RNA sequence: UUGUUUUCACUUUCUCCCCGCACUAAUGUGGGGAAAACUGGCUUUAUUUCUUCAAUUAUUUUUUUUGCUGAGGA
RNA sequence: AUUUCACUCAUAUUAAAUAAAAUAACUCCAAGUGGGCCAUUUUUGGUAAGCAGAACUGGCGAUGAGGGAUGCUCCUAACGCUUGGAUAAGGUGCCUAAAUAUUCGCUCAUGAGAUCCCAUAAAAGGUGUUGGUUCAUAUGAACUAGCCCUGAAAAUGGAUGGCGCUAAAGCGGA
RNA sequence: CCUUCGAUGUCGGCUCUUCCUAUCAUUGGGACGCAGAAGUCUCAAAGUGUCGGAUUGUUCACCCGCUAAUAGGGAACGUGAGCUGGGUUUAGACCGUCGUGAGACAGGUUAGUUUUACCCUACUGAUGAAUUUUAUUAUAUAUAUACAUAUAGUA
RNA sequence: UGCGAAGCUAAGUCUGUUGGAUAAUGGCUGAACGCCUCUUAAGCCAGAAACCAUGCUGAUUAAACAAUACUAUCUUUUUUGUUUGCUAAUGUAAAAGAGAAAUUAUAUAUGUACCGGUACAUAAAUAAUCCUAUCACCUUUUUCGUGAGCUGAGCUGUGAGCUAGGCAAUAGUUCUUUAACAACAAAAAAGAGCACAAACUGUAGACGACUUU
């Protein structure tokens, strides 16, 4: 809201509740980044999903499908259409504020380096009890045709690989500048070391 | 309210829209899938129509009311010259598709090859591919190396040699055909190794072999609805002419559906036509291309007077079973099954 | 809604029992054998010491409370598999045409012939953990054996149906293969 | 929307316009009240060209006076400024249109030397 | 044709005893018996700044930070 | 019966209450109108009808504004031009201003459900689940009514308004 | 009798497309009063196909025949600036019945002008610029960078 | 009137896939309900001319994009400015610290060490946190890290710091705190070929367009 972009990662998140919280953000100008959008969840089972998706490709313009509803079925496209339809895009604002949001399956090269947020609003964990049925966007996608899917699980395990080297040298970093931090403590002043340790710095 | 009497629809509507095609090379939509067990392999070539002629064969069909017995069956003539490895394109798997990592080149391409970056070759001073070709052997084998690590595709860039052909026109078409087989290595060695020489036909394809055959049918301008769908001609008594379809569509919707046949463009159509078998891969070397052992004649492939509207073939041929769309000198991509 | 509920099983002396996160292995002298029940919400303290396990639920309603018994079913299956293979005694039933079974791939892809004289190889491949062979005793008798109860009553189940009869009176033409048995080996 | 100049109140500015006057060249754009039998504007259909009212007006104390907080006053000779002899500090004067420039100038003379302010003071020079 | 009176049955235990004697969800547990009286309740005296003096209504008196407005000209 | 003289029957709150009751009463001249329609309730003919015919009141007409996505007649509310405040109807996940508010239950639908008018659903069923009632030594029955399910089929592609929503953004409350 | 009487071209056929499913055949199933064969009832299913002729203006109908099946419907009773014009439904004429008569007749018969697209859209094909507040699934010797990168012409 | 090449043409000739996930249904394990139960719970299987892919057609259907080949006076730093139709020349949908790269599970996770298991730690209002800001100047005493040139190594500069000193701010009470990013113009310093048309073609065609020389 405050920031010049947020990247938010998608993973375990419902498409709805989601794309509500991404929507009021962009209205508000809020520049924001969906990655990993092929983990979405989406409550009910995998085939009323399906069945719902189905509905959805049976829907054209008989006279000329060209000018028929585009379906899309990449997950980044589906969380695109889902905050269009929760946006007034037919406006100049609304159209800003779409054209705001970027979607992305995976963690693309600028984004796997940047920290990612989480809206609790909109986690599984949190907003759908545990004997009640749920989706996975990439998924259904691959279902209805998107046929990306392992490529992105192949990406995502080289990215977690990555990640876990650099996060062992962060980790190392860490615990050397914390021992600095103890050793340098006994140095400063003592009335500088009580406002610290009284302010718990 | 309902049709009186069903019948189908007139043509097809996974062949539209019936426009002009963008090229008249014919392009492979997709390639074969690749089989790892199989060592690495070329995967199409391209030839040029000559003709047609007919063959007599011995059937083989136990159980067939022909068997035993001698049948006459058109064949297609496509001269194929050998084609020239120039170049590879390493292609790696995306969600957006497939991207191209790099293109190298060999040390040395023909003006034969050059012309096909030129509209006006004849006035120009042809500096095309002039410095790029002497790139260090060490960048080579670095984006050679970066291909191999990265990439899951491997595509040869060939051309044609229309030089060995009757055709006026001499740029050659360069297309890239897929390497399909063993390891990313063992088809960047495969390329690698006959990164500039001749391809011949028989080493692609094998004799009784099926393909494909990708190519533009013959062009015919626009074509009424009558020629172009093939709907009933209206009776004798039609006050506007009877070469047309009646009613274009009911009154709801209010529109004309894309389903209803229209005067338009018929013909220049590209195709993929599958199971196209080789009879015969005719050598160039060989005096005796058109002889078979029930004739022992000393002839060739081209028939006497020359080959209608094409010329003569003086090269290596492929002689296919049944018809292939395009006019005589059209380029036709030979593709594996 | 009951505040909790719990239910107890028994681990047989021969076993070794981790479960982390319901995420339940067990270790036998015939295999080894997994099942998660993370579809569940079920709190499982494994007591390795003095044996046995126990799931309990806290405030279950009827229709979870109903899982906890197919849970502890499933365990003790799982026990009694790892022990003792289960053993899916089949047999092969025909009234004018003999049913010719032929296994293969070290006890595994068993291929029938001449079901209703087809003369059409009618194969069906084993689940893994699972073995096919015939009986020793019984010429028209076949063993489907394995340490996992759902793989192996899988297996027969899939012989079973690979061999229905079609466009005939089903209570007629009796020819098949049917599961005789269910026993432990 | 009000505009206030210290006393002055303008409730209201950009007079009204007849209703589709905008799209047709035959319909000038001066008021008149749609008489119509669905006329919209006449109905006072939300957004679209209303129509003038009595509560418009402006404050009578404040009412003809010019942005100089003076009422005008047009002559057209220099006999007609006697009455602003007595009032020249809440009357201005404009020069009538088809004066002269001698007359213009005799005028803008008697109006200096009376100190009365002058609207159209630089017309025709 | 209402009142009046009587009986038992009602509590905590980080207590004890027996049985299962580790069997529990449990740093405990199920069943069967005892115990006083911490706990809980009541009766007296002093206090309400250790702590509480609530809430609602009636009746009164203030208070923090602040938005908009200034007709008139006796 | 009338007439004339006497006496006197609250009035200082007014021969019961309340009343921007004289904004009255009366007279003259004259316009337009004299096809009506709708809603609640009652009602006649008709199988029924957005059908035909009546009664009361209110509306639409003649009338905009806020809400019901949309709508001549429904709800709030009727209108000079403004500045603040606070509300009605109705809403507070986004579209869309305001609750992903709080608190307690119910519901999983392989065609869930979701604001009067209003945009359809029945007889008959369910060993789905949630409460109750009455009978039989923690069991077997019979009922009962909430939500859900079957019953439940139409023609361009499609509509709780859309997205979507299941630890509701559904249903019944507070 | 709500909309159209300062006009929405009123039957049928031909042509052509699409849609529905309450499925005729074809696919896979369940039940049978199911031995086999044939059939009947029924489920998921609209992907594919549902014909040639005699008579009649006909729709409807009825036969001949093929077929695997010759299923039922919608789209302004789909479709007349698409046709045709046999019927109905102007004016000529004939018959029968009715009428004194002029004339009437869901009684029959015969002959009787079927206008316009060059506009918008739709559809079918055919050229074609411009596109930075635009785009990025990278680019750099086990290593940094969105605080970045990208001009343009030709092919 | 015969015959009639070439070209069109059908009545002539050739060609017209296989995977995934499912519906109906039949089943597995299995409680509810000691037994039973395809689930009318959880968890599974096989399965249709249907569905989605594969394949095919288009892709100015994405006002889409990549690699390549060649080329256009062109390309890199500083100062001042953008206060006959033109010939110097400016725009922001969003700077005020726009600070923050592990992964995952939600009836638990993550690291480490051994052989998915075992053991031990860590975490469990997680951003309710952490990190980053103000110490000007100049001089003095000095310490530690990086760049130019030089020969693993010395010097200069740069960043941080140590000792000591004196040295500045002032515009009348605030009117946005002119502070960012990107571009452009002028002046200075350094490095650097095609296409259309035309003629021809006819694999094309109403004209454009397209295939060619």
């Not at chain 1, 192949?154 to 931090?181: D, G």
């Not at chain 2, 020359?306 to 003569?312: E, K, Q």
């Not at chain 4, 003076?70 to 602003?84: A, S």
């Not at chain 4, 007595?86 to 803008?108: D, E, G, L, P, W």
């Amino acid at each position: 809201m405050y920031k010049k972009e947020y990247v938010i990662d998608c993973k375990g998140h419902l498409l709805g509740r989601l794309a509500s919280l991404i929507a009021k953000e962009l209205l508000n100008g809020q520049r924001i980044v969906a990655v990993r959008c092929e983990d979405i969840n989406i409550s009910g089972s995998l085939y009323r999903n399906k069945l719902k998706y189905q509905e959805f490709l049976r829907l054209r313009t008989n006279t000329n499908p060209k000018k028929g509803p585009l379906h899309l079925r990449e997950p980044s496209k589906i969380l695109w259409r889902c905050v269009r339809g929760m946006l007034p895009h037919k406006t100049y604002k609304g159209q800003l504020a779409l054209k705001k949001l970027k979607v992305c399956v995976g963690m693309p090269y600028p984004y796997d380096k940047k920290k990612k947020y989480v809206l609790p609003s909109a986690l599984r964990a949190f907003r759908l009890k545990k004997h009640r049925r749920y989706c996975r966007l990439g998924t259904l996608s691959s279902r209805v045709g998107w046929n990306y899917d392992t490529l992105v699980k192949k990406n995502e395990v080289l990215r977690k690989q990555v990640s876990k080297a650099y996060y062992k040298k962060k980790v190392n970093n860490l615990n050397e500048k914390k021992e600095i931090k103890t050793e340098a403590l006994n140095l400063i002043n003592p009335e500088q070391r009580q406002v610290l340790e009284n302010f718990g710095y | 309210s309902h049709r009186k009497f069903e019948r189908p629809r007139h043509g097809s509507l996974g062949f539209l829209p019936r426009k002009r095609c963008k090229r008249l090379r014919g392009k492979i939509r997709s390639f074969p899938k690749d089989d790892k067990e199989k060592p690495p392999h070329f995967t199409a070539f391209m030839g040029y129509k000559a003709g047609m002629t007919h063959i007599v064969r011995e059937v083989d069909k136990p159980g067939s009311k022909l068997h035993k017995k001698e049948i006459v069956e058109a064949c297609t003539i496509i001269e194929c010259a050998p084609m020239v490895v120039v170049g590879i394109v390493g292609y790696r798997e995306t969600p957006k598709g497939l991207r191209i990592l790099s293109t190298v080149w060999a040390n040395h391409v023909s003006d034969e090859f050059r012309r096909r970056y030129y509209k006006n070759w004849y006035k120009s001073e042809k500096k095309a591919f002039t410095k790029s070709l002497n790139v260090p052997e060490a960048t080579k084998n670095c984006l050679l190396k970066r291909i191999e690590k990265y990439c899951t595709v491997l595509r040869a860039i060939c051309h044609t040699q229309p030089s060995k052909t009757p055709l006026r026109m001499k740029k050659a078409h360069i297309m890239e055909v897929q390497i399909n087989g063993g390891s990313m290595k063992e088809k960047l060695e495969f390329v690698k190794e006959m990164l500039e020489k001749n391809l011949p036909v028989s080493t692609v394809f094998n004799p009784n072999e099926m393909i494909d055959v990708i190519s533009v049918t013959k062009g015919h301008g626009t074509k009424g609805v009558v020629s172009r769908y093939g709907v009933k001609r209206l009776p004798r008594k039609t006050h506007r002419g009877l070469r047309k379809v009646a009613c274009i569509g009911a009154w709801h919707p209010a529109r004309v559906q894309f389903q209803i046949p229209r005067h338009g463009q018929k013909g220049y159509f590209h195709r993929t036509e599958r199971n196209k078998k080789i009879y015969r891969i005719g050598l160039k070397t060989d005096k005796n291309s058109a002889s078979t052992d029930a004739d022992i004649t000393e002839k060739k492939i081209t028939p006497m007077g020359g080959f209608p509207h094409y010329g003569v073939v003086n090269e290596d041929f492929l002689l296919l079973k049944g018809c292939v769309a395009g006019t005589k000198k059209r380029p036709i991509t030979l593709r594996k099954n | 809604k009951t505040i909790v509920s719990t239910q107890k099983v028994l681990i047989p002396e021969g076993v070794k029992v981790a479960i982390n996160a319901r995420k339940v292995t067990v270790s036998g002298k015939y295999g080894t054998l997994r099942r998660s029940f993370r579809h569940l919400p079920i709190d499982i303290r494994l007591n390795k010491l003095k044996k046995y396990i126990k799931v309990v639920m806290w405030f279950g309603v009827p229709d979870s409370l109903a899982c906890i018994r197919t849970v502890c079913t499933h365990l003790k299956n799982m026990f009694t598999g790892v022990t003792k293979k289960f053993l899916y005694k089949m047999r092969l039933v025909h009234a004018h045409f003999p049913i010719n079974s032929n296994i293969v791939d070290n006890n595994t892809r068993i291929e029938i012939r001449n079901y209703l004289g087809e003369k059409s190889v009618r194969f069906v491949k084993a689940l893994p953990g699972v073995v096919i062979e015939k009986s020793p005793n019984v010429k028209d008798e076949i063993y489907v054996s394995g340490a996992d109860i759902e793989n192996v009553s899988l297996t027969a189940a899939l012989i079973h149906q690979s061999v229905l009869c079609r466009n005939k009176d089903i209570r007629k033409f009796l020819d098949g293969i049917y599961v005789s048995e269910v026993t432990t080996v | 929307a009000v505009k206030k100049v210290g006393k002055i109140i303008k409730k209201r500015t950009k007079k009204f316009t007849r209703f589709q006057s905008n799209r047709f060249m035959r319909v000038k754009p001066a008021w008149r009240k749609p008489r119509g039998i669905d006329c919209r504007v006449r109905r006072r259909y939300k957004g679209t060209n209303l129509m003038p009212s009595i509560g418009y007006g402006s404050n009578k104390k404040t009412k003809f006076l010019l942005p100089n907080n003076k009422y005008k006053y047009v002559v057209k000779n220099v006999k007609e400024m006697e009455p602003l002899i007595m009032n020249h500090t809440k009357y201005c004067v404009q020069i009538a249109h088809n004066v002269s420039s001698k007359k213009r100038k005799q005028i803008i003379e008697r109006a200096k030397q009376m100190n009365v302010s002058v609207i159209n003071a630089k017309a025709r020079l």
